[PDB]
Coordinates of C-alpha atoms and ligand atoms in Angstrom, one line a residue:
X133 CA 3.3 3.8 -29.6
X134 CA 5.7 5.0 -27.0
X135 CA 5.5 6.4 -23.5
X136 CA 8.6 8.1 -22.2
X137 CA 9.3 7.0 -18.6
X138 CA 10.7 9.6 -16.2
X139 CA 11.8 9.5 -12.6
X140 CA 11.3 13.0 -11.5
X141 CA 13.5 15.0 -13.9
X142 CA 15.5 12.1 -15.1
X143 CA 14.7 10.1 -18.2
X144 CA 14.7 6.4 -17.3
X145 CA 13.7 4.8 -20.6
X146 CA 10.7 4.1 -22.9
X147 CA 7.7 1.8 -22.8
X148 CA 6.7 0.6 -26.3
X149 CA 3.5 -1.1 -27.3
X150 CA 4.0 -2.9 -30.7
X151 CA 1.3 -3.4 -33.3
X152 CA 0.7 -7.0 -32.2
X153 CA -0.1 -5.7 -28.8
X154 CA 3.2 -6.9 -27.1
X155 CA 4.7 -4.5 -24.5
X156 CA 8.4 -3.8 -24.4
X157 CA 10.7 -1.5 -22.4
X158 CA 14.2 -0.1 -23.0
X159 CA 16.3 1.8 -20.6
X160 CA 17.9 5.0 -21.7
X161 CA 21.7 5.1 -22.2
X162 CA 22.0 8.2 -20.0
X163 CA 20.1 6.4 -17.3
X164 CA 22.3 3.2 -17.5
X165 CA 25.5 5.4 -17.4
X166 CA 24.8 6.8 -13.9
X167 CA 26.7 5.1 -11.1
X168 CA 23.5 5.5 -9.2
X169 CA 21.2 3.9 -11.8
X170 CA 18.4 1.7 -10.4
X171 CA 15.9 -0.5 -12.3
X172 CA 12.2 0.5 -12.7
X173 CA 11.5 -2.8 -11.0
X174 CA 13.4 -5.7 -9.6
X175 CA 11.6 -7.6 -12.3
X176 CA 13.0 -5.4 -15.1
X177 CA 16.8 -5.4 -14.3
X178 CA 19.1 -2.8 -15.8
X179 CA 20.2 -3.9 -19.3
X180 CA 20.9 -2.3 -22.6
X181 CA 18.6 -4.4 -24.9
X182 CA 14.9 -4.3 -25.3
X183 CA 13.0 -6.2 -22.5
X184 CA 10.2 -8.2 -23.9
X185 CA 9.2 -10.6 -21.1
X186 CA 5.7 -10.6 -19.7
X187 CA 7.2 -8.8 -16.7
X188 CA 7.0 -5.5 -18.7
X189 CA 3.2 -5.7 -19.3
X190 CA 2.6 -7.0 -15.8
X191 CA 4.6 -4.2 -14.2
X192 CA 2.7 -1.4 -15.9
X193 CA -0.6 -3.2 -15.6
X194 CA 0.0 -3.3 -11.8
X195 CA 0.2 0.5 -11.7
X196 CA -3.6 0.6 -12.5
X197 CA -6.6 -0.3 -10.4
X198 CA -7.3 -4.1 -10.6
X199 CA -11.1 -3.7 -11.0
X200 CA -12.5 -3.8 -14.6
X201 CA -15.4 -1.5 -13.4
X202 CA -12.9 1.1 -12.3
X203 CA -11.0 0.9 -15.6
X204 CA -14.2 1.6 -17.6
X205 CA -14.7 4.7 -15.4
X206 CA -11.2 5.8 -16.3
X207 CA -11.8 5.4 -20.0
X208 CA -15.0 7.4 -19.7
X209 CA -13.3 10.2 -17.7
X210 CA -10.6 10.9 -20.2
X211 CA -12.2 9.3 -23.3
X212 CA -9.2 6.9 -23.3
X213 CA -8.6 5.3 -26.7
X214 CA -9.5 1.9 -25.2
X215 CA -9.6 -0.2 -22.1
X216 CA -6.0 -1.3 -22.7
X217 CA -3.3 -0.5 -20.0
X218 CA -1.0 1.4 -22.4
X219 CA -4.0 3.6 -23.3
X220 CA -5.0 4.1 -19.7
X221 CA -1.5 5.1 -18.7
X222 CA -1.4 7.5 -21.6
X223 CA -4.2 9.4 -19.9
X224 CA -3.4 9.1 -16.1
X225 CA 0.3 8.2 -16.1
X226 CA 1.7 11.6 -15.1
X227 CA 1.3 11.0 -11.4
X228 CA 1.4 7.3 -10.4
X229 CA 2.3 5.2 -7.4
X230 CA 6.0 5.4 -7.0
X231 CA 8.1 7.6 -9.2
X232 CA 7.1 6.5 -12.7
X233 CA 5.9 9.4 -14.8
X234 CA 4.7 8.3 -18.2
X235 CA 4.5 11.1 -20.8
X236 CA 3.2 10.7 -24.4
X237 CA 7.3 24.1 -12.6
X238 CA 5.9 23.5 -9.1
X239 CA 2.4 25.0 -9.3
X240 CA -1.1 24.2 -8.2
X241 CA -4.8 25.2 -7.9
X242 CA -6.3 25.6 -4.5
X243 CA -9.8 24.0 -4.2
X244 CA -12.6 25.5 -2.3
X245 CA -14.7 23.2 0.0
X246 CA -17.4 23.3 -2.7
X247 CA -14.9 22.5 -5.4
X248 CA -13.2 19.7 -3.3
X249 CA -16.6 18.1 -2.8
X250 CA -17.2 18.1 -6.5
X251 CA -13.8 16.6 -7.3
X252 CA -14.2 13.8 -4.8
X253 CA -17.8 12.9 -5.8
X254 CA -16.5 11.9 -9.2
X255 CA -14.6 9.0 -7.6
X256 CA -15.0 -0.9 -7.6
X257 CA -13.2 1.2 -5.0
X258 CA -11.4 3.8 -7.1
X259 CA -8.9 6.0 -5.3
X260 CA -7.5 9.4 -6.3
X261 CA -4.9 11.8 -5.0
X262 CA -4.5 15.5 -4.2
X263 CA -1.7 17.9 -3.3
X264 CA -1.9 19.3 0.2
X265 CA -0.5 22.9 0.6
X266 CA -0.8 24.1 4.2
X267 CA -4.4 23.4 5.3
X268 CA -5.8 23.4 1.7
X269 CA -6.4 20.6 -0.8
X270 CA -5.2 21.3 -4.3
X271 CA -4.9 20.0 -7.8
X272 CA -1.3 20.0 -9.0
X273 CA -0.4 21.5 -12.3
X274 CA 1.8 19.8 -15.0
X275 CA 4.0 17.1 -13.6
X276 CA 3.7 18.6 -10.0
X277 CA 3.0 15.6 -7.7
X278 CA 0.2 14.8 -5.3
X279 CA 0.9 14.2 -1.6
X280 CA -2.1 12.2 -0.5
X281 CA -4.1 9.2 -1.6
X282 CA -7.8 10.0 -1.1
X283 CA -10.2 7.2 -0.4
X284 CA -14.0 7.2 -0.4
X285 CA -16.2 4.8 1.6
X286 CA -16.5 1.4 0.0
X287 CA -18.3 -1.3 4.3
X288 CA -20.0 2.1 4.4
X289 CA -17.7 3.0 7.2
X290 CA -14.4 1.9 5.5
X291 CA -13.0 5.5 5.8
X292 CA -13.4 5.5 9.5
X293 CA -12.3 1.9 9.8
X294 CA -9.0 2.5 8.0
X295 CA -8.4 5.7 9.9
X296 CA -8.8 3.9 13.2
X297 CA -6.6 1.0 12.1
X298 CA -3.8 3.3 10.9
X299 CA -3.9 5.2 14.2
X300 CA -3.7 2.0 16.2
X301 CA -0.9 0.6 14.1
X302 CA 1.1 3.9 14.7
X303 CA 0.4 3.7 18.4
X304 CA 1.7 0.1 18.5
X305 CA 5.0 1.0 16.7
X306 CA 4.3 0.0 13.2
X307 CA 5.6 2.0 10.2
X308 CA 2.4 3.3 8.7
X309 CA 1.4 6.6 7.0
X310 CA -0.4 9.3 8.8
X311 CA -3.9 9.9 7.6
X312 CA -6.7 12.3 8.2
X313 CA -10.5 12.2 7.8
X314 CA -11.6 15.0 5.5
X315 CA -15.0 16.5 5.1
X316 CA -16.1 18.5 2.2
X317 CA -19.8 19.3 2.2
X318 CA -21.5 15.9 2.4
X319 CA -18.4 13.9 1.5
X320 CA -16.3 12.1 4.1
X321 CA -13.0 10.7 2.8
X322 CA -9.7 9.4 4.1
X323 CA -6.6 11.4 3.0
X324 CA -3.5 9.1 3.5
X325 CA -0.1 10.8 3.4
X326 CA 2.0 9.3 0.6
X327 CA 5.3 7.8 1.5
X328 CA 6.3 7.7 -2.2
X329 CA 6.7 11.5 -2.1
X330 CA 9.1 13.8 -0.2
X331 CA 9.4 17.6 0.0
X332 CA 12.9 18.9 -0.3
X333 CA 14.2 20.9 2.7
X334 CA 13.3 24.3 1.4
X335 CA 9.8 23.1 0.3
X336 CA 10.3 24.3 -3.2
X337 CA 10.3 20.9 -4.8
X338 CA 8.2 17.8 -4.2
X339 CA 10.0 14.7 -5.2
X340 CA 8.7 11.2 -6.1
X341 CA 10.3 8.1 -4.6
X342 CA 10.5 4.8 -6.6
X343 CA 8.5 1.9 -5.2
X344 CA 6.8 -1.3 -6.3
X345 CA 4.5 -3.8 -4.8
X346 CA 5.2 -7.5 -4.4
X347 CA 3.4 -8.6 -7.5
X348 CA 5.7 -6.2 -9.4
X349 CA 8.9 -7.2 -7.7
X350 CA 8.2 -10.8 -8.6
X351 CA 7.1 -10.1 -12.2
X352 CA 3.5 -11.3 -11.4
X353 CA 0.1 -10.2 -12.7
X354 CA -2.3 -8.7 -10.2
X355 CA -4.5 -11.7 -10.8
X356 CA -2.3 -13.9 -8.6
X357 CA -2.0 -11.4 -5.7
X358 CA -3.6 -13.9 -3.3
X359 CA -1.7 -16.9 -2.0
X360 CA -4.6 -19.2 -2.9
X361 CA -4.1 -18.2 -6.5
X362 CA -0.4 -18.9 -6.5
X363 CA 0.7 -15.4 -5.1
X364 CA 3.4 -14.8 -2.6
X365 CA 2.8 -15.5 1.0
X366 CA 4.8 -15.0 4.2
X367 CA 7.6 -17.5 3.2
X368 CA 8.4 -16.0 -0.1
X369 CA 8.3 -12.4 1.1
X370 CA 10.4 -13.2 4.2
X371 CA 13.0 -14.9 1.9
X372 CA 12.9 -11.9 -0.4
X373 CA 13.4 -9.5 2.6
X374 CA 16.7 -11.2 3.2
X375 CA 18.1 -9.2 0.3
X376 CA 16.7 -5.9 1.7
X377 CA 19.2 -3.2 2.6
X378 CA 17.3 -3.3 6.0
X379 CA 16.8 -7.1 6.3
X380 CA 16.7 -7.4 10.1
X381 CA 14.4 -4.5 10.5
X382 CA 12.1 -5.4 7.5
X383 CA 11.7 -9.0 8.5
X384 CA 10.9 -8.0 12.1
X385 CA 8.4 -5.4 10.9
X386 CA 6.8 -7.8 8.4
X387 CA 6.4 -10.5 11.1
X388 CA 5.1 -7.9 13.6
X389 CA 2.6 -6.8 10.9
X390 CA 1.3 -10.4 10.5
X391 CA 0.6 -10.5 14.2
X392 CA -1.0 -7.0 13.9
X393 CA -3.3 -8.1 11.1
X394 CA -4.4 -11.1 13.1
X395 CA -5.3 -8.9 16.1
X396 CA -7.3 -6.5 14.1
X397 CA -8.9 -9.1 11.8
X398 CA -7.4 -7.6 8.6
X399 CA -8.3 -10.3 6.1
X400 CA -7.2 -8.7 2.9
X401 CA -3.4 -8.5 3.3
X402 CA -2.5 -9.8 -0.1
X403 CA 0.8 -9.3 -1.9
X404 CA -0.1 -5.9 -3.4
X405 CA -0.5 -4.6 0.1
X406 CA 3.3 -4.7 0.6
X407 CA 5.8 -2.7 -1.3
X408 CA 9.5 -1.9 -1.4
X409 CA 11.4 1.3 -2.1
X410 CA 13.9 0.8 -5.0
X411 CA 17.0 2.8 -4.1
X412 CA 19.9 4.2 -6.0
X413 CA 22.0 1.3 -7.3
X414 CA 19.1 -1.1 -7.2
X415 CA 19.0 -2.0 -3.5
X416 CA 15.6 -2.1 -1.8
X417 CA 13.8 -2.0 1.5
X418 CA 10.2 -2.3 2.8
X419 CA 7.9 0.7 2.6
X420 CA 5.4 1.5 5.4
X421 CA 2.3 -0.7 5.6
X422 CA -0.9 0.5 4.0
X423 CA -4.5 -0.2 3.0
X424 CA -5.3 -1.5 6.5
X425 CA -8.9 -2.4 7.1
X426 CA -10.5 -4.5 9.9
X427 CA -13.2 -7.0 9.0
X428 CA -14.6 -6.8 12.6
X429 CA -17.0 -3.9 11.7
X430 CA -18.6 -6.2 9.1
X431 CA -19.3 -9.0 11.6
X432 CA -23.1 -9.6 12.1
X433 CA -23.9 -7.1 9.4
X434 CA -25.5 -9.8 7.4
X435 CA -24.4 -13.3 8.4
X436 CA -20.6 -13.0 8.4
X437 CA -19.2 -14.7 11.6
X438 CA -15.9 -14.3 13.4
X439 CA -15.2 -17.9 12.5
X440 CA -15.4 -16.9 8.8
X441 CA -12.5 -14.4 9.1
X442 CA -9.3 -15.7 7.5
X443 CA -5.8 -14.2 7.0
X444 CA -4.9 -13.7 3.4
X445 CA -1.4 -15.1 4.1
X446 CA -1.6 -18.2 6.2
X447 CA 0.7 -19.2 9.0
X448 CA 2.2 -22.7 9.7
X449 CA 0.1 -25.3 11.5
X450 CA 1.0 -28.8 12.6
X451 CA -0.9 -30.3 9.7
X452 CA -0.7 -27.6 7.0
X453 CA -1.6 -23.9 7.3
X454 CA -3.4 -21.9 9.9
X455 CA -5.7 -19.2 8.5
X456 CA -8.7 -18.6 10.7
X457 CA -8.2 -15.6 13.0
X458 CA -10.4 -17.2 15.6
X459 CA -8.2 -20.4 15.7
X460 CA -4.9 -18.6 15.7
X461 CA -2.8 -18.5 18.9
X462 CA 0.8 -17.5 19.6
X463 CA 2.1 -21.0 18.9
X464 CA 1.3 -20.5 15.1
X465 CA 3.4 -17.4 14.9
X466 CA 6.2 -19.1 16.8
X467 CA 6.1 -22.2 14.6
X468 CA 6.1 -19.9 11.5
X469 CA 9.1 -17.9 12.7
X470 CA 11.1 -21.2 13.2
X471 CA 10.7 -22.5 9.7
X472 CA 11.4 -19.1 8.3
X473 CA 14.5 -18.6 10.4
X474 CA 13.1 -15.6 12.2
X475 CA 14.8 -15.5 15.6
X476 CA 12.5 -16.9 18.3
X477 CA 13.6 -14.2 20.8
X478 CA 12.3 -11.6 18.4
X479 CA 9.0 -13.4 17.8
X480 CA 8.6 -13.5 21.6
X481 CA 9.4 -9.8 21.9
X482 CA 6.7 -9.0 19.3
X483 CA 4.1 -11.1 21.1
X484 CA 5.2 -9.7 24.5
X485 CA 5.1 -6.1 23.3
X486 CA 1.5 -6.5 21.9
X487 CA 0.6 -8.2 25.2
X488 CA 1.4 -5.4 27.4
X489 CA 0.8 -2.4 25.1
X490 CA -2.5 -3.2 23.4
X491 CA -4.8 -2.1 26.3
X492 CA -3.1 1.3 26.5
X493 CA -2.9 1.8 22.7
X494 CA -6.6 1.2 22.3
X495 CA -7.4 3.9 24.9
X496 CA -4.8 6.3 23.4
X497 CA -6.3 6.0 19.9
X498 CA -9.6 7.4 21.1
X499 CA -8.3 10.9 21.7
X500 CA -7.5 11.1 18.0
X501 CA -11.0 10.2 16.9
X502 CA -13.2 13.1 15.8
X503 CA -16.4 13.8 17.7
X504 CA -18.5 12.2 14.9
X505 CA -16.4 9.1 14.7
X506 CA -18.8 6.1 14.6
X507 CA -18.9 4.3 17.9
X508 CA -19.9 1.0 16.4
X509 CA -16.6 0.9 14.6
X510 CA -14.6 1.4 17.8
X511 CA -16.7 -1.1 19.7
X512 CA -16.4 -3.8 17.1
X513 CA -12.7 -3.4 16.6
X514 CA -11.8 -2.7 20.3
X515 CA -13.9 -5.6 21.6
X516 CA -12.5 -8.2 19.1
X517 CA -8.9 -7.0 19.5
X518 CA -9.2 -7.4 23.3
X519 CA -10.6 -10.8 22.9
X520 CA -7.7 -11.9 20.8
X521 CA -5.2 -10.0 22.9
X522 CA -6.2 -12.2 25.8
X523 CA -4.5 -15.1 24.0
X524 CA -1.2 -13.1 24.2
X525 CA -1.6 -11.9 27.8
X526 CA -2.2 -15.5 28.9
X527 CA 1.2 -16.6 27.6
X528 CA 3.1 -13.3 27.7
Ligands
LIG827 CL1 -7.1 -22.5 10.7

């Protein structure tokens, strides 16, 4: 009951699943010997002995979708031995988030539009991935990696929503992946460029880059990804970012992203929505932001009010925490920066920058929207962002 763990062409170690169900991991000697060795996770530090803490199971479980519905689909798809994580990874672990390849050259298969449509229809929001070669979507062969995360609509306009949000984030200076709306027959999907992949200079090899999300970095199960369930919030992440190889930048970017989520009404920014690259030696830094969706297009859809929108990670408030997007003003971000030791001049710069740049960014994003982009999505997001933006322009 072993799965060999590879990081590209280098053997990292082995995941073992004992008869009693316990999961253990052991690094390979040749891996530990490298002066450039790095751990699979900050929660699984380099060592010679077997690692038996719950961090092993949690780390691997976090590589799989959180929804039980999606896991049942996976079992069905590959007739997986069971619903267990070790068994699921035995079927789909060749290409995962980050660089972890789990096994029990460069080549691919180009897909036609008809074939691409069929592949995507198969995919409780289960995402998949494909390899882009030129202007064609492809299925990679063997251990050849994918280059894009493909998402289908959830929120029937979630593909368009996320596309818009990623464009706006990029226009406002945030580190986010590029994405494109793809159409195959009657399917409309979002193809997000992966930042855990990098082509070599000659484009003959596509490499995987190690990364892990915040639940993984802290050894936590996906079940506590939300702060209300005991998961990490702004304080814990900002404290963690102090050890980043890019601390100043990462803390600034993370705080800027909290202001951005507020402006765009992104209510689902839980711990698994943030990740770090694990670099040679074991150092780490923040990866780009991702899985960005605005709740504004859902307003009025049934009964959901703007007063019902809450940030997943709350800010400081005089009497506790501040979570309602509609009640948040610059003073909450400034109070938060203070207790977290995030330079006030920097928080001001972040607020000032959004104050003068938002109006132009909203107009600029429109040119990158396809002709069939849904106007209701633009109106709902643009109108609500401008309403909140007024609170910044009034002080900054
Ligand atoms: Cl509040």
